[PDB]
Ligand binder design. Structure first.
Ligand SMILES: CNC(=O)c1sc(N2C[C@H]3C[C@]2(CNC(=O)c2c[nH]c4ncc(Cl)cc24)C3)nc1C(F)(F)F
Length: 269
């Protein structure tokens, strides 16, 4: 039964606050903060973790976390669990526990690769491998009919073995139909994926250079799309362009995109 399966997922997702130690702030936004932490594991040893801090909304957070914790794919970030701490003002402070990624987010990695002390120049073959990794994570989520809604290179994390995983599930990433009638589908995530592939191929450029966020709906409506990057194969550009076809039904699925990206990668020496 669907209910008993949700009750199990809820029991599995909560981490006792005594098993966690909070460290330094890694990042701090408006919606919350990211801190380093230590999680005491079942095997009696501690693991370095990243801790993100934000009745109905609490239950909704828990239910959503219970679903994400259930995800099991190498290209999807693992949710280790959640804690609910209470602020001095009696305001709930939900915390989400994730593996710590020393390499950080993909967008920052890309930008650092263009600096001397940062990682070395990323070869085309490795940039394509990052695209395959994200398509695999998205294929997993779309098959489970789970919408990401904020896919961008900044929301992709690099693991220690250089595997990319999708995480955190922005006008220049939003599909033409979601700007026009609030409609959001799996084909809208395919559009954001095309935009993300373009960010990887330009090594971190902000999409639509020279175009202002308020000019975006008019720009797309008139048929304009992201331009081909200088260091990008024609085969790759066609793939990212197929993500931005006006009619969402004409856009390929993540499965189709993944296979095209894998084939192009295999074709490279
Ligand atoms: C220069 N990079 C940054 O400032 C970024 S980007 C980012 N995120 C992108 C998306 C929102 C998300 C929050 N973090 C995680 O979910 C992490 C899981 N595991 C990690 N291990 C390390 C780190 Cl740094 C982060 C995480 C995923 N968070 C930072 C942070 F933490 F520094 F504030």
């Amino acid at each position: 039964s669907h209910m008993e399966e949700l009750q199990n997922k809820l029991e599995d997702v909560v981490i006792d606050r005594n098993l966690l130690i909070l460290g330094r702030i890694l990042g701090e936004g408006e919606f919350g903060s990211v801190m380093e932490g230590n999680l005491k594991q079942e095997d009696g040893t501690s693991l370095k973790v990243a801790v993100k801090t934000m009745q109905r909304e609490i239950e909704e957070f828990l239910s959503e976390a219970a679903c994400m914790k259930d995800f099991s794919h190498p290209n999807v970030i693992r949710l280790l669990g959640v804690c609910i701490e209470m602020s001095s003002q009696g305001i709930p402070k939900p915390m989400v526990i994730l593996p710590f990624m020393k390499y950080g987010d993909l967008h920052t990695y890309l930008l650092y690769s263009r600096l001397e002390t940062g990682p070395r120049h990323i070869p085309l073959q490795t940039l394509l491998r990052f695209m395959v990794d994200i398509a695999l994570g998205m294929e997993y989520l779309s098959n489970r009919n789970f919408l990401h809604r904020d896919l961008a290179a900044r929301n992709c994390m690099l693991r220690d073995d250089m595997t990319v995983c999708v995480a955190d599930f922005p006008v220049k990433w939003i599909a033409i139909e979601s700007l026009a009638d609030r409609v959001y589908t799996s084909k809208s995530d395919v559009w954001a994926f095309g935009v993300t592939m373009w960010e990887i191929a330009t090594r971190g450029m902000t999409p639509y250079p020279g175009v202002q966020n308020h000019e975006m709906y008019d720009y797309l409506l008139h048929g304009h799309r992201l331009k081909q990057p200088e260091d990008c194969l024609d085969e790759l550009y066609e793939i990212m362009y197929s993500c931005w076809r006006t009619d969402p039904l004409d856009r390929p699925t993540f499965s189709v995109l993944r296979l095209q990206l894998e084939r192009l990668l295999e074709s490279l020496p």
